[PDB]
């Protein structure tokens, strides 16, 4: 079961570079080096994210799409940046405007054809393809825009394979852009009708969780990103290893998404203790559930406690007894029966791998599908409408060949999506 990562846009690229920086380490794959892997088990499944060509050069199977040179020209000129095959670099020297429509209809539309070519060359790699990974930001052109096209085409060329998407939703408190809510509403629309697994990350939730769960005084982007890359490896990659109870994308999805819409999840790491001090090593198991299921520690901005849960996926990865896990999970579902849905006897879906993160003893990826994520689409819709009404920076969209009813479409869709989420939140 192979897969093909996709670093759409600037953010998606920056974060992507960190995800591969991480992932490689969990497979002993040096820049241009070969398999230095501490063990031999970190090789039995490499195929899934790499490619066999020479015999010492296992190249990551990802795609780099962006209309801004600077990005691709900084990631390929650094560390592991020199591992990607030139063919993978799908750049577009055009005008990388921060406009969703400009990167989906005018500038993005051209490089798209030059994308489909590669996305087909990589899909036809080997073994059996499972799905595609897509990373990007809902606060820019090449991210929300170019990324919104890539999915609509991918999910039409292979409506069989799954589609995981890691989006960096526009943080509330402070928005790192001005058109932000526009590019968001417009991209979420296509996502909720293409991708079948979306992990919303919050630039401001990262800061928080990195300022209170990590004594880090200077949380650089690289850091933030790294945290994400650590969680997103626990999702996919992890499950591609043996284990007492192993899972995989399919199992994971067909167990977490009750309604065809797509549903949004919430990534969460387990052992999140500061280096020096904090190193209590308290990882028996009950300490992990305490963390993960807490408010703080949830990559989303909204708090689970503000909305029922639909499903949960405990992706553990560390030698442990199937008793102290499955039991605990139950206890938690009883202690917090209030918000955890009743029409579902067993919301939590326990998974237990074996091999842990290289230097750590035991970890556990958290993927919660709570209806609490409503307090995000609402936010966006608010900010959107609030400026839409006055057609704020609307002329910047239309002028790139768009429709004024298109904005309505997006809003409507995402708004209806809110309805559904509430129909099962009560």
């Amino acid at each position: 079961r192979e897969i093909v990562h996709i670093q759409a846009g600037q953010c998606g690229n920056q974060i992507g570079a960190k995800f591969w920086e991480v992932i490689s380490d969990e497979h002993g794959i040096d820049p241009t080096g070969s398999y230095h892997g501490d063990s031999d088990l970190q090789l039995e499944r490499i195929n899934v994210y790499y490619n066999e060509a020479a015999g010492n050069k296992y190249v990551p199977r990802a795609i780099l799409v962006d209309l801004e040179p600077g990005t691709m020209d900084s990631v390929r000129s650094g560390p592991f940046g020199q591992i990607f095959r030139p063919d993978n670099f799908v750049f577009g020297q055009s005008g990388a405007g921060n406009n969703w429509a400009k990167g989906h209809y005018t500038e993005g539309a051209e490089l798209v054809d030059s994308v489909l070519d590669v996305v087909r060359k990589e899909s036809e790699s080997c073994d059996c393809l499972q799905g595609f990974q897509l990373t990007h930001s809902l606060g820019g052109g090449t991210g929300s825009g170019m990324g919104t096209l890539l999915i609509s085409k991918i999910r039409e060329e292979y409506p069989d394979r799954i589609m995981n998407t890691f989006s960096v939703v526009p943080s509330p408190k402070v928005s790192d852009t001005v058109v932000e809510p526009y590019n968001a509403t417009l991209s979420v629309h296509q996502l909720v009708e293409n991708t079948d697994e979306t992990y919303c990350i919050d630039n401001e939730a990262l800061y928080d969780i990195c300022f209170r769960t990590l004594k880090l005084t200077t949380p650089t982007y690289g850091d933030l990103n790294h945290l994400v890359s650590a969680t997103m490896s626990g999702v996919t990659t992890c499950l591609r290893f043996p284990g007492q109870l192993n899972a995989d994308l399919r199992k994971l999805a067909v167990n977490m998404v009750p309604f065809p819409r797509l549903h949004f999840f919430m990534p969460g790491f387990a052992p999140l203790t500061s280096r020096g001090s904090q190193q209590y090593r308290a990882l028996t198991v009950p300490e992990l559930t305490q963390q993960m299921f807490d408010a703080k520690n949830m990559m989303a901005a909204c708090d689970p406690r503000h909305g029922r849960y639909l499903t949960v996926a405990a992706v553990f990865r560390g030698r442990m007894s199937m008793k102290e896990v499955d039991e605990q999970m139950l206890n938690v579902q009883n202690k917090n029966s209030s918000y955890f849905v009743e029409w579902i006897p067993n919301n939590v879906k326990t998974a237990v791998c074996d091999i842990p993160p290289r230097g750590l003893k035991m970890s556990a990826t958290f993927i919660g599908n709570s209806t609490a994520i409503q307090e995000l689409f609402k936010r966006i819709s608010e900010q959107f409408t609030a400026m839409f009404r006055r057609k704020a920076f609307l002329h910047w969209y239309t002028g790139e060949g768009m429709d004024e009813m298109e904005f309505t479409e997006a809003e409507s869709n995402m708004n209806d999506l809110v309805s559904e989420y509430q129909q099962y939140q009560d």
Binding site: R261, M405, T408, N413
Partner: protein, 337 residues
């Protein structure tokens, strides 16, 4: 508003079908409006004697029911004349055929050369029913949940691309990216149907060779200025199938896609009937769930008078699928336009 016009028809057992297995008397007729059912089978459902295929009785309620003996001409008499008049009136109208595999839905829709179907008959009636007139035709097929335009010229490889289903200024969803041809005469429409046949996907099944892979939607919009806009749409949906067990391969995938799409209509109607009973602050409409449901939204929830053609298979094996279909129609009858 009025309840959806629904008619139930059954197809006669084929000689080959009869030879394979002969179990008749499953469907009986009582009154033109209603059907009485007693179905025989090799074995009944294993439980206390309840609704089984072995020997059981059931009741069907519909506007009108047709026997195995008569074909499309009977449908043309009652349905074709009145339905076309509504469209001329400017009122939107839509008719589709629903039923299990081997029900002969293509027979109702297209019809044979000797016996013209609903579409060719309605085409004749529109002229009779018919001031400036403008008319265009759109023809497309949905295969593997992807849309193709029948109008597209014949070629080795050709894809229309995904249908641009975007809601415009109008609240009701509209289908775009469809090529349109002016309708001067019936023959022009017929020609479009003929060329469309080649483009439309076809396949053979254990049940029947005629089997259509893709659902077919024929849409004709008439604009008349004494401009009134009216849309007449005739849809030929593919039926459900056991063939999935019998065959595999691409055929399995096509069946899976159809069975999922067919189910979305069923869930929608179920919600719709429930919506009919419940006053408010209840379950939402599944239109958004599937693309097919979205397009059909106007049909189910919004504007336009609707009529449905349900085909039934007298086969005992098919009984569970047919019962569900009948149940679907019964539930659909509950809600009003």
């Amino acid at each position: 508003s009025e309840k959806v016009k629904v008619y139930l028809r059954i197809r006669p057992f084929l000689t080959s079908e009869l030879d394979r297995q002969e179990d008749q008397g499953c469907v009986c007729i009582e009154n033109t409006e209603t059907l009485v059912l007693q179905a025989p089978k090799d074995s009944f459902a294993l439980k206390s004697n309840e609704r089984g295929v072995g020997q059981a009785t059931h009741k069907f309620t519909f506007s009108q029911i047709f026997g195995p003996e008569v074909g499309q001409v009977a449908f043309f008499n009652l349905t074709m004349k009145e339905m076309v008049k509504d469209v001329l009136k400017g009122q939107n109208w839509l008719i589709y055929t629903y039923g299990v595999t081997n029900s002969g839905k293509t027979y109702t829709i297209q019809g044979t050369s000797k016996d013209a179907g609903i579409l060719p008959q309605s085409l004749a009636l529109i002229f009779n029913s018919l001031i400036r007139f403008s008319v265009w035709i759109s023809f497309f097929e949905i295969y593997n949940e992807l849309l193709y335009d029948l109008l597209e010229p014949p070629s080795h490889q050709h894809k229309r691309q995904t249908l641009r289903l975007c809601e415009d200024q109008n609240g009701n969803p509209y289908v775009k990216d469809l090529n349109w041809i002016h309708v001067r005469d019936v023959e022009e429409a017929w020609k479009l149907l003929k060329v469309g046949r080649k483009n439309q996907s076809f396949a053979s099944t254990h049940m029947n060779q005629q089997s259509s892979r893709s659902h077919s939607i024929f849409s004709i919009r008439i604009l008349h200025l004494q401009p009134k806009i009216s849309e007449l749409s005739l849809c030929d949906l593919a039926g459900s199938e056991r063939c999935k067990h019998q065959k595999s391969g691409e055929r399995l995938k096509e069946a899976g896609n159809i069975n999922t799409s067919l189910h979305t209509l069923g869930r929608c109607i179920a919600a719709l009937r429930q919506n009919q009973q419940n006053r408010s602050k209840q379950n939402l409409i599944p239109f958004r769930d599937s693309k097919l449901t979205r397009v059909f939204q106007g049909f189910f929830t919004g504007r336009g008078r609707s009529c449905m053609i349900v085909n039934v298979n007298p086969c005992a094996s098919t009984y569970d699928e047919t019962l569900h279909a009948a149940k679907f129609s019964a539930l659909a009858s509950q809600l009003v336009h």
